[model samples]
Target chain A: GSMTLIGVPRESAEGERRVALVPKVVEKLSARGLEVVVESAAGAGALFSDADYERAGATIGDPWPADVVVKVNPPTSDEISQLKPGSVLIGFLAPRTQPELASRLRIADVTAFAMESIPRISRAQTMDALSSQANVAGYKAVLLGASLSTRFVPMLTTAAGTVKPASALVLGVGVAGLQALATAKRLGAKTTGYDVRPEVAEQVRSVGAQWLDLGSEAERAQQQQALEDAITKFDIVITTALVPGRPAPRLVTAAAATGMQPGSVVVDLAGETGGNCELTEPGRTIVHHGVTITSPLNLPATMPEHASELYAKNVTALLDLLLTDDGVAPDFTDEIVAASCITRT
Target chain B: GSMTLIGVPRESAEGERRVALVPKVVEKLSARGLEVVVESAAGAGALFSDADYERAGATIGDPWPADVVVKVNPPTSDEISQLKPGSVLIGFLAPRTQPELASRLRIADVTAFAMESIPRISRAQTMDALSSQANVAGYKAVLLGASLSTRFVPMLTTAAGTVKPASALVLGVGVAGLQALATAKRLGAKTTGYDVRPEVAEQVRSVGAQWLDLGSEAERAQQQQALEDAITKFDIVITTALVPGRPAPRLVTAAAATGMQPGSVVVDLAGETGGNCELTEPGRTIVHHGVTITSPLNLPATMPEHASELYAKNVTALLDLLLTDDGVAPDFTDEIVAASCITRT
Candidate 1:
């Protein structure tokens, strides 16, 4: 098989520290006849030095003019101009959010794949960038909550008396929410999880937390009352409710947040696309009515090493489907390839 | 029996947030015929409002002229001037370090009991302020380390492959070291603990951590080599070694720290009295040779609620030993009393 030169450019997006491919993945790709060329200091934010990437069989130099280009974020106009025509481009190309980028890829005749559009099937689970990144975000959200909290998470018994564990409520039971529940439980907090979807109750219970049911009629009223009361009692609340290409649903009201005790913390994971809390300010931490509300953006970028590692594997899985013996091959027949393709040439 | 008046003064020392008495202790003392008065906002740092103290049977006002005055840090000269002659002063009065304060207490004819001087005996364990505060510092150190770390502490298995757990080394085996080991282990890190005292190996093992033997070789040379090698491998190193009234022993040298991997974190719990890491700057976080060295001062003050609660119980235990049918009583013959007394008239 002829070697396919894959270029990995440094992400130019502000505050974006994550790289599409890491050194370990470069080594893996190199073993499979993919020659990787990384932009100088491409993985610096993720703490991987250029020397480290070079040691793993990646060439550290200009990444343009390659057969394929990979990135964590959508390319800038300036970056798009440097790409060779008909070259393959891959990333979390939010085609819906950035329709201009999609149109630009089509005009350039670039075969662009959007990682966000990968089909949610068992076979494509390994290629699910959203889940992989959300897992990192969830873990980070809990750590942020704990750090900002004025109280201890674990219940402690001393001669003085018992110090009760911090009560944590996680809204929405997605990949991020489940990881938050697990991390909070590991820190010995009394955790409770709630989601509009009633089916997530069992998944919440699996993480050793109480599942809050927001079910039918009289039960719904009772659950609503219980939720409001529970919000006041919680020392920490993490909101991970996100709708792709839409504003995050408001799960926590300003009145409910004001009812919370002083020194409580609320982490809004959907800050990039509005927030789940009424009081949350995107990309900022604010103290309102004595409760600390933090709306964190790009939590995965903050812990770039593992985040990039997870994302790179997801990208590699996608590549396994796209790469062929002669050149890059995109099979429209396959559900994953068909769904992920933004502009196939 | 006459009512014994116990006062809790607002901590006057800069950055000293912990109060010697809390609301729960006020309730307990009041039940035992000890009328309590708290200085205005004495418990503010500990997040207890004046109304909270009043609800617990304490009068909020100037705490001077009472039979007993309790505080967290040693009093300043201005604070000493405010104390009534023959009134009792109780606190973590570092009598050895603050000899001037000890001398003034004698000149004022104040009955002073230094919490730091309390004998480490089974009966007096509940009154050991040093141990209690050390426990809080140790727990907080691990949190700080994890919060500042660029990578995840726990290992995660994803499609990306297994993320190996962070390696953490705790240098010391006392109260703080034990707590650091417990916390790091709880966070699922591959934890290793080292101490000069070989007996602490059992305690380290109890917390599910591997104990590195720093055994005597020609009395210490081989131990130095072992420590340097171990330090280089750790993603996090928490040093809690301290000796009362002396500079902390330098356990990590600049050369040793330079050997460590980039993005590693070192937390020096002994920062206030010098630090165990040569690279540590007291009360500051500095990146030296690509490793972050944070020297935290008075870590217990950062989490005032539980710290104050634990400290107040220790103060109450000491008060139980000193309170009499009259104003106050000091038993010079009792080992605990004799050991803790800084000055008595």
Candidate 2:
């Protein structure tokens, strides 16, 4: 068994502070017979210094020439040029939208795995970057809404008077939506959740949020009417209705958004691939008709410290599944490796 | 007597969004014989429109020539010129810092009451504008800190791993510090409170925050040493120690602040006078030694809607005490009025 070198690079993208591996995860892999190399100052955005990584038994030098490279974002052209042929590379190489990047990997003769393609199965749950990042996005979305809000989310009785709890509506009952509902509830908001699939209603209720059923024989027109009416009643609306490789569903209409109370807030988490709200300006925060609509392209990147740690663990699980005793060889037999392997030499 | 008009002017200060009176309170005063005059766009910052004020029977016109005037901030030079002689004026007149402003009131022959000078008593609890505004500031401080934080304040068990709750420390258990503790606790942070006065420790615990005691015979030297040591351990530290007219007490020295864990945050609520954290730069957010320190001078104004509403109630209580059937008149015999009166015609 040869010692395989794992590379962790500083994110090249401006505003992206997340790193692929943290000190704790670096130590974990280092203890498991793996030599790690990290780019100088790679973890600065997440508040991790070179000294910390050095203390974790990782080399603070060029990560580009390592046997295996891990990244938080898709590689730059220069980074691809630095990759050794047939060497293992892993990251969120946008295979769907940017298929050309995958082609670049194929031509470079590199064996690469796309974190986005990790299969959503029980065995690969720990390796599912989408779910883990979505979890961070969900928690962050609620806090962002609360920060932007002009009123208290929690109900309070004081010398002033009885302050009623603010109402929050989360559109789409996926992992991000459920976490949002719970986070809002934790902030003392009266939370309600909605999804096209009725089966997820129970899961929504389990997170201390009431389910909003827009399902019926006459679910389309009447349901949309109910939705518009319901959405306007909430003080905060967080929409996470994104479909992988497709534009997010327009769950909140302009009319509905404008109809909410003047000081109300709308946080659209699907801003990366268009937003769930008709009026959402993808990466901008604007106030329209007295309603504030904030659509951050990357909510997870904002909470880089924890986001990076969780993402490091997700990457770690995949590494465990792929790294072999002799350098590194990802077994194609495993569904996770099969699905995530975008290009192979 | 003819109907006495109570004027509510649009705040002349930029970045000031809070209105002295809200539409609901306008309706209450209007229903009780006092006529209300609100400047057009007076409540715009608080998200209250002219239509809302009109519906509440308030005149959307120039409020300067009215019998009584209520304001949120100190009057600007132009605004002072608009005040009618011998008219009743009420606001947070900087009597201590800007004694010249009170002298201007005397020269103008105006009867002015300073909200800052309001007596602290059970009878005048509803009229405590300082406390109400501080409450808003406290809540906003925690939300701001959470928003700027790199990690989640609340702990959660996920597929990747379990996240530990971040620790929070609040200095000076005044209204703002106590509220900051409760708000951080609501966000699921393990919170602790500290104050120079031991009597306030009960209020700290009342808000569900554990108190830190640095008192005793050998309190000064070792106490300061313990204070610095204890301050650095918490991930989030909020300081609200202001001594009336003096600069805020330096509970968190520069040494304490820079020693906190990487990605930690320090929010100084006493940024207007000075900051409790020595490193705090009055109204700036700076990152030093891996710690983000934010000092917002007007945190309440950031959450203008509720802040304005609560402040409106505080103003209304004072109005209720002063308004007579014949005309608007302040009974100087009352301690609240006696203490608040800065100048009289």
Candidate 3:
């Protein structure tokens, strides 16, 4: 059996707590004739100790000169310089945003598999890291919103009087939006969902949330008016509208925010790519017109334990398809492999 | 009709955010031939603005020489000196704990009704301030615990794997404990309740939680062994054991906490008067033996809007029983009046 060694480096990106591989996944890879080498304190942010990783058959310390290197974020130029020539590198290679990194990887003669480029197909669902991480972020957004709100989420009937339930609105009924809606609903909040894609209404309703119709392009003026009016009624608003490589679309305008009641919260999940709210400041929590706007980046990092576990499993699924008897070999015939392979030497 | 003036002063106690009365209650008192006077920014902590109080027919100022002074916490010496002689004072006068304050009120010729001394009978249920505030604290504890937790409260099944529901234990099945169990259950956590009073087993089960019986003193050794073993299994523990004026009973031993897993949270609701947990630091959050111990004092103050509303209604119920066509008069024959009258000159 040919043994392939994979290296796990501590994420260099600030506030990135998630690791590419966890201790549980290390044991799984070991079973498949693969050796895992994890950097010291690689899983500290995620509350996983080096002893835990070592007990699960992973070597601690810098595992240089490896056959493959895996990470969460795109590698910096300094990281690329340390990698072995012609070795495989796996991660979320933001090719559209970081063209220089792509050029550097090409110059280093490194074969790269971009996790973000995984095809949205039935077979690749298990290996969909973007959706998996997005799911965690969505769940966290609700908790943050609820915690920050001055009012209770659920309608409580006490001896004093009945306190009405808080109203929540989620923009963009994607993986993140659906999860946010589900979480808000689970906490007994009156939740509503809105999206540009009219087809997502059914998905929103499936999660027991009311779907808000933004109207067609023909009634653009009416749609704008409806959104402005609707935005003021919600106690919590979570914006998740993103166009992949493009700036997040502006959904909640400043004028619309001004109409909102004091103590209302707006969680901008797309803050990393110039948030969906016009007033959002990336990575900062600001109060605009009596509304709290939290522009959080990489929310999954806040709950690193679960996030890393899910990420490791997603990477493990990808490994099963990429691993060959000789070492890293991708089946280009498979659409997932072809789409995910950013560069192959 | 002789109009009686009631004064609402801003809470002077450090970290006490809850107001004695809200704007809505000000309107109620106004309609009942009671003129409301409020100190500047009295209801600010509870999100009730000066304008809101004024709109509810309250005069904003020092309301000096008032007939009645309504407050939440014990007034300072400065406040006591300023009050008109023979004025009626109503509040949570912890008479047993603060015997000096009771003596001061008697010497000042102030008639004071202690909210803490209200009879726990059927007729006085509406005026049960302790129960009302405890309910709010209980609900808030679960939210705090869930948000602070490293893992999700609910059981989540994703493409990666199935994550089990968080295990939560509520010690002392009183008003707060019952509410905690209900709130935790609402958020999809696996909940368990423990109490010294075996009769409360039915009440715990009523809220969809399994009850743990500590057994009689005859089996003290076995009960201690069971408690030690059981405490380690929970991811979240909320202790609400209070013995009136006495210091809170030590239920969770430090040794038991050491056996618990890392990232486990323990919310000591009885932290204000010496916590129920041996390791709890009052009014602080400390991580000990891989466990997060949050001894939150005045949990109700954190969410003052609902807390104030409930507290005001409880105060209103007591007023309904005390107020007559004449001025301040208390029938000593009534059990509630006799029990609650801490200082009557």
Candidate 4:
């Protein structure tokens, strides 16, 4: 058939969620001359169900066989073994993390596209799954802060009296931090933010929270001390500061936690890479010196199904552009592949 | 020499720092003719140390014997055995969670003061340990949010570029939400809030972010559908919505996750009570449809030392009127005691 065939296998990896292409984007693919084949019960917990995919012109099969295959995590060894040679396989194939499996796929001559290796070009906006997923994680961090908080978030005025609004402090200004600030603003918090990059202050304020400027002759003169002093002023604090590959900087100290107003809450999004708040214990919520510190790892994994679905769409998009009709892989001569390939070639 | 000895046991709880009284406050008890005996290292986390208590006119010992004892969590059987018969003890005794322990205390004939049972009244505010501790937890939650976030909490502009500030949404507009909003605004986040109580809309707007009216007739008209729609519009969603003893309402659903803009986040502060967001997994960070949901449990325990200090202050305030030189235990007839004592004669 002239239309493309999209096949999904039963996710083999523990906690895998990518199910070929989700129904939400299948219509878009269909408009682009693509037919879809989905395994039964694919897309559960992530939005698109088998019924939803079928309604979008997708075929159902016990062992879906198609021209293109997509998944979130790596395929199981059995699934990989069954793949037809020269078929296009797309998903988060962390080759470095699973060298043996990726090697097997290569030896099998199956054309593979790694979603994590997608180029960050303007054209790839819809397919930049990492940034998309990170953005959600940032927002979720702030929500966690609010929920764990013991006090009210917004101010309340009643016949009895007026309750003051909450004060929230955000630590980083990356993709996730920006979204967290934006979401915190939406919740009516008097938000404040800080980052090592001084240039992000305006962006922080644009979200309607205050910009806590910790840089200056004084702050620079005594970096750790000043940073800790500045951190203690707020009632609610969220930290997402990170240095990528290195441990997150500790901006909140024990002294700072002690000084914070009683009943304050802190949500640490950088907990996975060592926490930004000094008191934060990774994967634990603790109260120290009258402060609640929440440090959670793997924020994206909590909503596995949706994360998988979105990831699957990104993989599909990347593969469609990189595979030939006979499923010969695209040449990696382009700058896109060079920039996104994190693993050794 | 004739005064009854009051033993302030070194807190047995892991990571606890504050004693029942700080040096500055302990002097007050000394003035009241009540001899204060404190265990060594009780205030180490708060940096007071045994020497500080000694200078404050209190005797210190490793296992200070006294007519009365103070603690946080219940004492172990060994600890209970150490207390003299008919001794007085004060702390948050979880009667419901530890019925057997309560019976043990009763058999020991010790008069126990449950600080958690303090009433939420104007006069009792100082003694309200729950409120005081929760206040710190609320503020700290925001700090954690900021620190964990990948973006700056505040906005900024530079010669390189002008970045739009981030937006933040606060769920559950309780005390913590208000504090988070205030902190977010101070950090320069565009903050907004949502609640079943329509009264909080203005409070949200006052903190800076545009108030999202999820309480309006239109929102009520569709119920869950409206919540899903609301969840999609914000970049950062902080969920604090909760019902005491019941699972938190599902405000952010799986379907809503797909609508979220790429890079959005959701912080599930209601993780302990079964998160308000549908995607939240307690004590984990998960991703769904490009959205991040973080569920952090026990946020308050992160800053143990300082939280204990504030809690100790609250207890002292509540028991100030009950202290007597005659070694008479707190009169249960007092309104404060009546309200706080769960197991009454």
Top candidate when judged by DockQ against the true structure: 2
Q: Best-fitting candidate, measured by TM-score?
A: 2
Ranking by DockQ: 2, 3, 1, 4
Q: Residue B221's C-alpha lDDT in candidate 1?
A: 74
TM-score of 3: 0.93
Candidate 3's C-alpha runs over 4 A off are A214-218, A288-290, B63-65, B214-218
* lDDT (10s digit) by residue, model 2, range A219-313: 57898998999999999999999777899899999999999999899999888888999999989999988799999888888888889999999
Q: TM-scores of the first chain across all predictions?
A: 0.95, 0.97, 0.96, 0.81
lDDT of candidate 1 at residue A289, scale 0 to 100: 67
Per-prediction RMSD in angstroms? 2.7, 1.6, 2.5, 9.4
TM-score computed on alpha carbons, candidate 1: 0.93
How high is the CA lDDT of each candidate model? Answer: 0.85, 0.88, 0.85, 0.67
Look at candidate 2 and tell me the lDDT of residue B276.
85
- Model 2 chain B worst lDDT window (10 residues): B212-221
Query: Which structure among the candidates has the greatest lDDT?
Result: 2
Worst 10 residues of 4 chain B by lDDT: B154-163
Judged by DockQ cut-offs, is candidate 4 incorrect, acceptable, medium or high? incorrect
Please give me the DockQ of candidate 4 compared with the native complex: 0.05
Model 1, span A1-345: residue lDDT tens? 246889999988889889999888999888777789999989878767888888888899878778888889888888988889978888899877897888898898788889999988999979989888998899889989987776678887754446889999999989999999999988879999999888898999999999875436888777766777678879999999988889999888887788987678899998878899889999999888668899988898988878888889998889888888877877899999888888854
Candidate 2 at B48: error in angstroms? 1.7
Q: For candidate 4, what's the TM-score of chain A, rounded to 2 decimals?
A: 0.81
Give model 3's DockQ, 2 decimals.
Answer: 0.50
lDDT by residue for model 3 (A198-312), tens:
8998999999999997554758878888898899899999999999789999999887777787668899998989999999999998877557899889888877777888888
Clashes of each: 0, 0, 0, 195
Which is the better candidate, 1 or 3, if ranked by TM-score?
3
Query: Model 2, B210: alpha-carbon shift in Å?
Result: 1.4
